[PDB]
């Protein structure tokens, strides 16, 4: 599983085994840095504007 995030503030779960993404999730500030958390939880984080 991978993730891809657009200029339109959209986050995208590219499962390598698929051509259609899994969870077309959606949030402001998705242009900026995203990351998988170094925990067992699949925690996501976006960060701009001291937020």
């Amino acid at each position: 599983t991978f993730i891809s995030a657009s200029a339109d503030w959209t986050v995208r779960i590219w499962d390598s085994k698929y051509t259609s993404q899994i969870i077309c999730f959606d949030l402001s500030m998705m242009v900026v840095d995203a990351v998988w958390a170094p925990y067992s939880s699949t925690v996501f984080a976006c960060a701009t504007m001291d937020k």
């Binding site: 599983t1 499962d15 899994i22 969870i23 077309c24 925990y39 067992s40 939880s41 699949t42």
Partner: peptide, 29 residues
Amino acid sequence: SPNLCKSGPEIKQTEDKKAMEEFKNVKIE
């Protein structure tokens, strides 16, 4: 630190969670 880990659902239920995300796709359809 309180938001460190939940330690039960994150670990071995995570593959089930990805299957559940694929289920949410079947739901989208």
